[PDB]
Amino acid sequence: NQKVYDITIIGGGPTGLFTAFYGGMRQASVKIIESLPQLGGQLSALYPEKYIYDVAGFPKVRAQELVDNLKEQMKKFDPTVCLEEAVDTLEKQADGIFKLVTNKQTHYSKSVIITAGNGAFQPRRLELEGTAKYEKKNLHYFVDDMNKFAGKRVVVFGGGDSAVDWTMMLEPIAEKVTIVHRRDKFRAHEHSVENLMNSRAEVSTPYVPVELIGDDKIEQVVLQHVKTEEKVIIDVDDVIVNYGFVSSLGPIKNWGLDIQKNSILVNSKMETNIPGIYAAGDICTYEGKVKLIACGFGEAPTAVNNAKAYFDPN
Amino acid sequence: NQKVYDITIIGGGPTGLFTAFYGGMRQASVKIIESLPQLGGQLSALYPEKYIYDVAGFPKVRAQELVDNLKEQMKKFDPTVCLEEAVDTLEKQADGIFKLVTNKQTHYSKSVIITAGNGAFQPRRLELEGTAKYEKKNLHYFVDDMNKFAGKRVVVFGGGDSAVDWTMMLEPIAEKVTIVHRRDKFRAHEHSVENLMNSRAEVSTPYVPVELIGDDKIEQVVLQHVKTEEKVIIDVDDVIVNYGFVSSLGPIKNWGLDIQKNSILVNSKMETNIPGIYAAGDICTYEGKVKLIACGFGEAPTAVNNAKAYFDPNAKLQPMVSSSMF
Ligand SMILES: Cc1cc2nc3c(=O)[nH]c(=O)nc-3n(C[C@H](O)[C@H](O)[C@H](O)COP(=O)(O)OP(=O)(O)OC[C@H]3O[C@@H](n4cnc5c(N)ncnc54)[C@H](O)[C@@H]3O)c2cc1C
Numbered sequence: 001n002q003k004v005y006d007i008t009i010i011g012g013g014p015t016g017l018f019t020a021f022y023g024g025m026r027q028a029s030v031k032i033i034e035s036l037p038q039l040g041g042q043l044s045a046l047y048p049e050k051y052i053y054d055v056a057g058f059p060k061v062r063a064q065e066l067v068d069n070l071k072e073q074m075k076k077f078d079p080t081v082c083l084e085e086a087v088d089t090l091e092k093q094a095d096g097i098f099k100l101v102t103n104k105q106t107h108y109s110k111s112v113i114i115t116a117g118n119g120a121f122q123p124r125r126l127e128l129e130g131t132a133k134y135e136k137k138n139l140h141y142f143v144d145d146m147n148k149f150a151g152k153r154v155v156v157f158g159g160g161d162s163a164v165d166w167t168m169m170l171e172p173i174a175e176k177v178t179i180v181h182r183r184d185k186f187r188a189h190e191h192s193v194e195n196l197m198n199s200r201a202e203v204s205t206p207y208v209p210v211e212l213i214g215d216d217k218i219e220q221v222v223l224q225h226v227k228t229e230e231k232v233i234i235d236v237d238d239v240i241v242n243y244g245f246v247s248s249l250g251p252i253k254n255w256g257l258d259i260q261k262n263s264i265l266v267n268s269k270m271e272t273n274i275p276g277i278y279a280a281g282d283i284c285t286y287e288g289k290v291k292l293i294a295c296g297f298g299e300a301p302t303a304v305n306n307a308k309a310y311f312d313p314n
Numbered sequence: 315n316q317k318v319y320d321i322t323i324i325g326g327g328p329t330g331l332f333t334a335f336y337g338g339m340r341q342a343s344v345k346i347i348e349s350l351p352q353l354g355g356q357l358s359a360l361y362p363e364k365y366i367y368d369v370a371g372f373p374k375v376r377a378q379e380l381v382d383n384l385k386e387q388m389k390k391f392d393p394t395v396c397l398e399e400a401v402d403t404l405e406k407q408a409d410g411i412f413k414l415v416t417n418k419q420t421h422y423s424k425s426v427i428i429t430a431g432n433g434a435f436q437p438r439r440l441e442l443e444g445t446a447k448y449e450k451k452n453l454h455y456f457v458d459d460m461n462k463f464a465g466k467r468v469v470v471f472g473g474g475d476s477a478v479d480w481t482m483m484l485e486p487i488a489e490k491v492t493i494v495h496r497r498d499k500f501r502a503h504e505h506s507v508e509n510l511m512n513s514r515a516e517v518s519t520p521y522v523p524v525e526l527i528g529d530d531k532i533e534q535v536v537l538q539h540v541k542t543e544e545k546v547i548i549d550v551d552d553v554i555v556n557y558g559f560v561s562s563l564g565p566i567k568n569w570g571l572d573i574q575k576n577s578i579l580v581n582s583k584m585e586t587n588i589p590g591i592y593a594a595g596d597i598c599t600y601e602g603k604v605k606l607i608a609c610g611f612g613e614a615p616t617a618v619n620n621a622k623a624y625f626d627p628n629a630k631l632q633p634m635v636s637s638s639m640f
Binding site for chain 2: 018024025053054055057058267268269270286289297300302305
């Protein structure tokens with residue numbers, strides 16, 4: 001958007017959602033940039049169902065059940081949420097405005113608050129050749145709509161819970177749905193795996209894919225047995241990968257921020273070495289910093305107010 | 315008894331309750347000392363029924379329900395709860411152990427975390443030493459039951475956070491709820507004033523009352539602007555004063571702690587100037603500190619871990635992930 005905002009939040013993590021809540025709380029046009037197509041950061045991506053106990057007020061809380069509590073607390077102000085954008089450049093222009101260039105567009109902000117935790121959460125890719133031409137066409141890593149694969153032969157890679165449920169959702173939808181894993185025992189919930197055999201889903205296991213046959217759309221996938229090392233091809237139309245999520249800093253170190261051991265040096269005002277750029281959550285660090293969500297929750301409003309004193313004279 | 319505890323927490327308020335939980339999170343014998351006869355601190359005593367919205371994770375949670383969610387969260391470690399004790403002396407003896415003397419007995423701790431308010435029980439009123447009879451009847455300072463002001467016309471005097479929210483929570487119950495302040499800007503969070511204007515709650519600008527029409531109960535309040543001197547009478551059933559300019563620290567001032575603005579000055583490690591003494595919540599202060607519950611909850615584990623690293627060297631600062639302790 002060409003409209004410069006007031007606070008642009010790098011990271012849709014738990015610190016980023018609650019900080020987005022506090023932005024409107026001080027009359028701030030709030031913009032969130034997230035590398036994922038989903039909010040939640042580490043919780044929604046790495047452990048959404050697990051119970052967390054050291055969050056203030058929650059003797060027992062699910063990770064994602066708290067995320068919805070943060071999104072609902074946040075939708076009270078409706079910030080401009082720009083998903084599927086990984087911030088690449090963060091540069092201060094001649095007038096103090098920050099120029100943020102992502103993979104989509106360039107966003108502008110009077111101040112930028114970086115709640116990025118450990119890095120950007122782009123999914124785990126493959127380990128083949130330049131599949132970018134498959135990725136732009138029929139090679140997917142996220143499931144937006146499941147019905148787009150109805151009547152098409154679809155292959156699924158992975159063994160986790162995330163992979164098995166996606167396959168079980170394609171049994172009455174996908175023409176031919178096959179799930180591939182490297183071991184005979186799916187690293188998933190046991191009673192959901194039992195339903196996978198009690199369905200029309202072909203279960204190829206233990207297999208690992210090798211060759212992605214397709215001129216530009218993947219139409220055949222060459223497998224290979226873990227023990228006998230025989231190659232088995234199955235004709236496909238779309239390919240779905242669910243191995244898990246990965247994070248990494250990348251361009252974060254090259255933004256002129258004092259970074260030592262993948263953490264931004266911030267003061268008690270949550271101010272980095274760049275005026276107008278603030279950080280909170282686990283991505284920040286200082287004397288006695290404890291990498292917690294409870295601490296990241298207390299670093300968020302401190303970061304909004306000290307930025308409010310940066311871009312708005314009271 | 316003569317147990318040299320590990321962490322003795324001054325204050326059974328909301329910040330101290332979460333701090334007591336996180337003490338057990340690092341395997342610390344926890345002692346809580348509270349001047350009130352009840353835990354909850356400011357919440358259980360001054361507004362136990364009101365709804366809180368700026369708590370991380372709770373878009374809308376009741377105050378006492380938040381206290382009970384903390385007490386339920388805390389009883390996982392069963393800290394030593396000493397009620398009705400106001401710490402008078404806090405001295406570090408020759409071996410580093412702190413000696414705490416309350417009105418009752420002498421307690422011991424390896425380290426001390428100060429989460430208490432002031433030890434007292436007083437918001438802040440105006441300057442009339444008469445009218446003493448309205449307070450026993452309809453001039454209130456505290457929200458006990460929300461229904462006692464329901465169906466009654468309630469007028470509120472003040473501009474702080476307490477004045478704007480009480481007016482906003484009396485809007486769907488009280489016939490006429492009015493907020494009166496001595497200044498042109500309600501010094502509150504911006505969206506609580508935004509919700510204050512967008513309702514039937516009558517919003518009185520800077521006014522100062524004159525005539526409390528009543529032999530013992532105020533039934534009409536004749537107003538007066540601080541500068542323009544306009545007379546506005548408002549029919550009321552209850553009269554509410556919500557200034558709340560904090561209050562003096564008291565026995566905290568005599569402990570050798572660097573104090574700025576009735577608040578203990580702490581570093582980013584939540585350390586006071588005394589090694590082994592920590593402070594968090596609204597009682598602590600530093601650069602850009604915001605007197606919030608969101609901040610005070612985030613300052614609490616900062617102090618527990620830095621204290622676990624104070625009295626126990628071979629313990630990692632970064633703790634064990636919470637899921638791996640259940
Ligand atoms: C398995 C596990 C268990 C845990 N258990 C606990 C526990 O019990 N208690 C506890 O207190 N803490 C726990 N934690 C820690 C907790 O998850 C973190 O402290 C918390 O997530 C910090 O919030 P954050 O937003 O800074 O991190 P994150 O959730 O990592 O936020 C990072 C977000 O920013 C985005 N992002 C990053 N870089 C970019 C970029 N360049 N462009 C665009 N978007 C970007 C990412 O996509 C992501 O959404 C646990 C962590 C893990 C991994």
